[PDB]
Design a protein around this ligand. Structure first.
Ligand SMILES: Cc1cn([C@H]2C[C@H](O)[C@@H](COP(=O)(O)O)O2)c(=O)[nH]c1=O
Ligand SMILES: [Mg+2]
Ligand SMILES: [Mg+2]
Length: 683
DNA sequence: TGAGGTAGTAGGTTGT
DNA sequence: TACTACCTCG
DNA sequence: ACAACC
């Protein structure tokens, strides 16, 4: 490292727990009927809530900061239709030691419920769970935006309250769908009932009368809702054709008077105005302090003391094209890290002629600097020819074309997806560049160029340094359906001079089956074997999010058997809180060790962006020092080739894995058979 | 579809 | 998880 | 149901 510094977390030390709070009441829970296996925990949480006071689940029972006599000790629960009778039996009170982890966990849950409960009786603040919104940040015709904070409250091992505070905004609609449309506002993309929290997707807006509309049951829309007594205080307006978010293939009648639009930033782009909800970190730190003080004051918890942590500045990563670069885009001028002779094709959908002179010039320039030969083909064919177009594609692929650039006006989602999938089935990855295009838009088309090159299989940049792991692979799950795709991507070589993806697998949920984890890993090992002519001495395993229990067990045992060292790191995009400099400036490359095997990592930060959200990492397995892992992950973040001016927050293999399973989730996996693993089709 | 993150808005999974 | 808006271009 | 993540 090149310097240890000091930072604030967005945490605050408050008053010590009083001697009553350290000795909570213990209660035994008795349910009739006794719940089933899968009901016990939700029922325990529910009874902890029905009890009242400040009580939480403790093991099979309850812990409370309220004595039992001021609790609702007897009552009834409803759960999925079934009714349960409950009674709570006082079992004395037992001291909890903050020095001990589990007991501290109980004290912390109690603290959280404390925060919730005291927030509940504030006036007149908009409270939503653990969020509190005081000020009004912005208003408008039928809409307003509130400003406040998301909060949390737990217990330190020294026995004091720790308050986490992070400024937050909240968008609220005040008028119904009918009233909303009565202001010249366009149709919102989403909407919810007024009687419950269920939401819909708003499509058309029919003109059929609600008192003469055949509802799948006999009665009409209008008196169907009137029977439920929904439009008594309300008033049904027009007919709105909504659709289920999980079943959009079945339009449904509804009443504009019984709907309330759910407002997003693209429902307020009309007003434009300003609505910048990102905060400069100085302002966010200020708001954090102010809010922390307010909360500590109104809740009788004392004056906040901003907590401090020792941070370490990490070595600057050394990015390489043919020469050293500061950004991946500079490889276009200097040359790529590695380049074979390549053949790119051009597909024009704007009816215009061949290659734009400046794109051609830039490509020739970059390949000249790389000392590699270039072939610019032009696709003289159009998708509206039908299968003949596919024939054209096949001929292009046979002549050595590796990827094609598609110049087109903005395409609709479906047409974009369909075109890319089609090109994929003929083994051709595609880069789209939108066709109102001027040479002055160099960021857009240099990035398009970079993506194009990554898709042809080139490595535009690489890292220079000594790293513990010679192979780094990321795992993620993606897809917007009942099922998901679990996928892996990798950087092979200490330099990261080879980026590969592997064929994903369909899976029920977020957890990736052990066999699948291993198989993807074996594919990446095989990539390494094929490039280096040996097995890697050490691999860095990067999981997006939490690592489900034993998910990597089989793969880790397999690695052990082959004599390959490993590190498993959980990389969490949220839950890391915030970090602020005690000193002057806030820079990235920041490494903040907290617990053992778990640390924070500020990978990316631009001042014109808001406040950075540091990654939270847990070293789940392996014996590599935290500092080395942080070092390599931080540098790997700089290895991504398809973003020429801004580095991703995630290490390249995870970013890649993510875009891979996202794209497979969109297009489907059926198109990927003839696409080379070296070609990053999904960037 | 230019890319990135920070913001927001919906939704989900894992697991006690 | 995945969407859009904002702003700018290590 | 809630948790700490996606
Ligand atoms: C009763 C009924 C309602 N609906 C639609 C119209 C209602 O506005 C919408 C919402 O009803 P709900 O929220 O009470 O479940 O369901 C049908 O499509 N068919 C039916 O048979
Ligand atoms: Mg994920
Ligand atoms: Mg792309």
């Amino acid at each position: 490292h090149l310097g240890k510094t000091e930072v604030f977390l967005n945490r605050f030390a408050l008053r010590p727990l009083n001697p009553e709070e350290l000795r909570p009441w213990r209660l035994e829970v008795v349910l009739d009927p006794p719940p089933g296996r899968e009901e016990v925990y939700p029922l325990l949480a529910q009874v902890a809530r029905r009890a009242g006071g400040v009580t939480v689940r403790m093991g099979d029972g309850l812990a409370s900061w309220s004595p039992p006599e001021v609790l609702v000790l007897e009552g009834t629960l409803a759960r999925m239709g079934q009714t349960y009778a409950y009674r709570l039996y006082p079992k004395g009170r037992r001291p909890l030691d903050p020095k001990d982890p589990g007991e501290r966990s109980v004290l912390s849950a109690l603290a959280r419920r404390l925060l919730q409960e005291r927030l509940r009786r504030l006036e007149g603040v908009w409270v939503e769970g653990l969020a509190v919104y005081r000020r009004e940040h912005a208003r408008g015709p039928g809409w307003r935006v509130l400003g406040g904070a998301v909060l949390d409250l737990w217990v330190s091992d020294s026995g004091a309250f720790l308050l986490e505070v992070d400024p937050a905004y909240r968008i609220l609609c005040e008028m119904s769908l009918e009233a909303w449309l009565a202001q010249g506002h366009p149709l919102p993309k989403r909407v919810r009932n007024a009687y419950d929290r269920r939401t819909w997707e708003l499509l058309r807006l029919g003109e059929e009368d609600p008192k003469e509309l055949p509802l799948p049951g006999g009665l009409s829309l209008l008196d169907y809702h009137a029977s439920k007594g929904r439009l008594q205080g309300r008033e049904g307006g027009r007919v709105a054709w909504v659709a289920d978010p999980k079943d959009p293939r079945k339009p449904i009648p509804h009443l504009t008077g019984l709907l309330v639009p759910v407002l997003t930033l693209e429902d307020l782009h009309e007003e434009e105005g300003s609505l910048a909800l990102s905060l400069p970190w100085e302002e966010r730190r200020r708001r954090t302090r102010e809010i922390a003080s307010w909360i500590g004051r109104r809740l009788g918890l004392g004056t906040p003391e901003a907590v401090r942590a020792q941070a370490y500045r990490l070595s600057i990563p050394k990015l390489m094209g043919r020469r050293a670069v500061s950004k991946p885009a500079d490889a276009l001028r200097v040359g790529f890290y590695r380049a074979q002779e390549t053949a790119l094709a051009l597909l024009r959908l704007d009816g215009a002629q061949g290659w734009p002179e400046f794109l051609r010039r830039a490509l020739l320039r970059a390949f000249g600097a790389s000392g590699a030969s270039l072939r610019l083909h032009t696709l003289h064919a159009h998708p509206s020819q039908g299968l003949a177009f596919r024939e054209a594609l096949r001929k292009a692929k046979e002549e050595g074309v590796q990827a094609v650039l598609v110049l087109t006006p903005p395409m609709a989602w479906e047409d974009r997806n369909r075109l890319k999938a089609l090109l994929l089935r003929e083994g051709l990855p595609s880069q789209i560049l939108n066709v109102p295009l001027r040479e002055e838009e160099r960021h857009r088309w240099e990035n398009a160029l970079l993506g194009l090159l990554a898709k042809a299989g080139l490595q535009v940049v690489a890292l220079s340094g000594a790293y513990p792991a010679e192979l780094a692979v990321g795992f993620d799950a993606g897809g917007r359906e009942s099922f998901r795709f679990g996928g892996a991507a990798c950087a092979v070589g200490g330099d990261g001079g080879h980026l590969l993806w592997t064929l994903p697998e369909a899976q029920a949920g977020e957890r990736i089956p052990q066999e699948v984890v291993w198989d993807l890993l074996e594919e990446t090992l095989w990539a390494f074997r094929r490039k280096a002519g040996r097995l890697p001495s050490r691999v860095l395993l990067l999981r997006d999010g939490r690592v489900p229990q034993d998910e990597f067990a089989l793969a880790l045992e397999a690695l052990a058997r082959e004599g390959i060292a490993y590190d498993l790191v959980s990389v969490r995009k949220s839950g890391g809180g915030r970090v602020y400099p005690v000193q002057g400036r806030l820079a990235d490359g920041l490494y903040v060790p907290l617990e053992d095997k778990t640390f924070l990592l500020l990978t990316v930060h631009r001042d014109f962006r808001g406040t950075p959200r540091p990654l939270k990492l847990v070293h789940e397995a392996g014996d590599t020092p935290l500092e080395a892992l942080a070092h390599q992950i931080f540098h790997l973040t700089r290895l991504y080739p398809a973003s020429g001016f801004a580095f991703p927050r995630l290490p390249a293999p995870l970013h890649l894995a993510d875009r891979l399973v996202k794209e497979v989730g969109r297009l489907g996996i059926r198109h990927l058979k003839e696409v080379d693993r070296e070609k990053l089709f999904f960037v």
